[PDB]
């Protein structure tokens, strides 16, 4: 039942990623299968609240990007070194 | 008002009974005459603490109390001593017949709907002393 709304990233790299996290979003990547990887931006507060549930890391999530729905599983998460924040997430296509 | 566990047969020994109720204001002689007539039919050596509703000028009248339960458990056990920590060492488990005989003492002065419930209250002190049922 986990649904996450995402945007396609229009800029990549250190500066753009830091600007995202200063604007209270964070970057993430969807890869796997035969499709090309998709780099996305997520809303930090909503996703941070969702990932508190243990089922976030075991269930099949749905990421809505540009209207299309993609079934994924959380694969890796980079956390802030000491704040309760998220830096990045890997999603693998399910 | 100084209260102590008064004996039923002995009247006016200075240490244990003098300040028990003779110093309260109760006529100790008349109390240990009327309650003594009661304890003449009561069994030998049963300390039964009644609730005192008395005066201070040699006038008295008393209410009755149920005879206790913890005194009568050590008869068939053969030991007149207690354990520092029960459920580890016991004075010898006793019979449900003796436990029900003890419960018979506190059966005629209760308002419970079902009388079978209070079989656990009597064994509360049984477990607190070392008398575990079979």
């Amino acid at each position: 039942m986990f649904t996450i709304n995402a945007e396609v990233r229009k800029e990549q790299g250190k500066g753009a990623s830091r600007r995202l996290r200063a604007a209270n979003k964070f970057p993430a990547i969807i890869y796997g299968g035969k499709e090309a990887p998709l780099a996305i931006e997520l809303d930090h507060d909503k996703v941070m609240n969702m990932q508190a549930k243990a089922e976030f890391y075991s269930e099949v999530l749905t990421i809505v990007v540009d209207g299309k729905e993609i079934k994924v599983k959380a694969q890796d998460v980079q956390r802030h070194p000491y704040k309760p924040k998220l830096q990045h997430i890997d999603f693998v296509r399910a | 008002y100084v209260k102590l566990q008064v004996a039923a047969g002995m009247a006016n020994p200075s240490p244990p009974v003098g300040p028990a109720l003779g110093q309260q204001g109760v006529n100790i002689m008349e109390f240990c005459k009327a309650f003594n007539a009661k304890t003449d039919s009561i069994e030998k050596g049963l300390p039964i603490p009644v609730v005192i509703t008395v005066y201070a000028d040699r006038s008295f009248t008393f209410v009755t109390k149920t005879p206790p339960a913890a005194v009568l458990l050590k008869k068939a056990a053969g030991i007149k001593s207690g354990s520092g920590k029960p459920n580890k060492d016991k004075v010898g488990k006793i019979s449900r017949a003796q436990l029900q005989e003890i419960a018979q003492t506190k059966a005629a002065d209760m308002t419970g709907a079902d009388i079978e419930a209070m079989t656990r209250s009597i064994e509360g002190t049984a477990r607190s002393m070392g008398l575990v049922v079979e």
Partner: protein, 135 residues
């Protein structure tokens, strides 16, 4: 008081202490005390905090120390002017933000929080209470 049983060399350059820590996850227990600041932790401090923690939990559960004082620190004695490096006097662990310093298991979370607060009161660096995460 932790200190290496033996070392290749007696004395070490001062160096510096930049960067973020490695070892930022509760890896052995369920709860952790994590550094938020940057600094040095002396062996005496590590041991004072360990004592405080352990007495708070009444020696129940399990406690891990994730840091070890492997850097020797020299001092020059009083009233000395050069003339070679001073003498090793104590040992420290370098701490960067994010470093999990202690972990606990086998106790309730409230008790772990209390024990860790008592411990953090012995340390020269700001810290925060963390819990194990599944990923």
């Amino acid at each position: 008081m932790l200190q290496p049983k033996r070392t290749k060399f007696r004395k070490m350059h001062k160096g510096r202490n930049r960067g973020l820590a490695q070892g930022t996850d509760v890896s052995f227990g369920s709860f952790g005390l994590k550094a938020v600041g940057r600094g040095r932790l002396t062996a005496r401090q590590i041991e004072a905090a360990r004592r405080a923690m352990t007495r708070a939990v009444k020696r129940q559960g399990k406690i891990w120390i994730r840091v070890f004082p492997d850097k020797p620190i020299t001092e020059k004695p009083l009233a000395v002017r050069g003339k070679g490096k001073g003498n090793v006097e104590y040992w420290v662990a370098l701490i960067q933000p994010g470093k999990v310093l202690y972990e606990m298991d086998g106790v309730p979370e409230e008790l772990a929080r209390e024990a860790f607060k008592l411990a953090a009161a012995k340390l020269p660096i700001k810290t925060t209470f963390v819990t194990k995460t599944v990923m």
